[PDB]
Design a binder for this molecule. Structure first.
Ligand SMILES: [Cl-]
Ligand code: NA
Ligand code: NA
Ligand code: NA
Ligand SMILES: [Zn+2]
Length: 128
């Protein structure tokens, strides 16, 4: 059972930091249970939390929401794009598509419950 009271960064990890190979139907089940719906799409970054969090130390750039707490990866990474293809919740089923792309994360100072880096990733802003 996932903790019931997650930080933004912890939810980012759960939703977007997962290793490959991974199967979309299985990998989405916890996320969907947590949100009580079949999420229509989700991108899994096939990199470690530590490596993704290190992107936060890179130059800050503008986000889609017009804040300036975003940061671009210095290299592309392998990622899987899970796209909902059928099922009534909780029977959610997905197609998978591999990608090899740069990403942009929004980062914030850690909350008290987060690992005590200078900044932690909280939102997958873009893939590009
Ligand atoms: Cl991972
Ligand atoms: Na509390
Ligand atoms: Na990984
Ligand atoms: Na960068
Ligand atoms: Zn949709």
């Amino acid at each position: 059972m996932w903790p019931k009271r997650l930080t933004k960064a912890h939810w980012f990890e759960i939703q977007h930091i997962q290793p490959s190979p991974l199967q979309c139907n299985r990998a989405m089940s916890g996320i969907n249970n947590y949100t009580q719906h079949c999420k229509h799409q989700n991108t899994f970054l096939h990199d470690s939390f530590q490596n993704v969090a290190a992107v936060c130390d890179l130059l800050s750039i503008v986000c889609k929401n017009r804040r300036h707490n975003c940061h671009q990866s210095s290299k592309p990474v392998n990622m899987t794009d899970c796209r909902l293809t059928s099922g009534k919740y909780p029977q959610c089923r997905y197609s998978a598509a591999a990608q090899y792309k740069f990403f942009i994360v929004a980062c914030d100072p850690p909350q008290k419950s987060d690992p005590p880096y200078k900044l932690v990733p909280v939102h997958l802003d873009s893939i590009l």
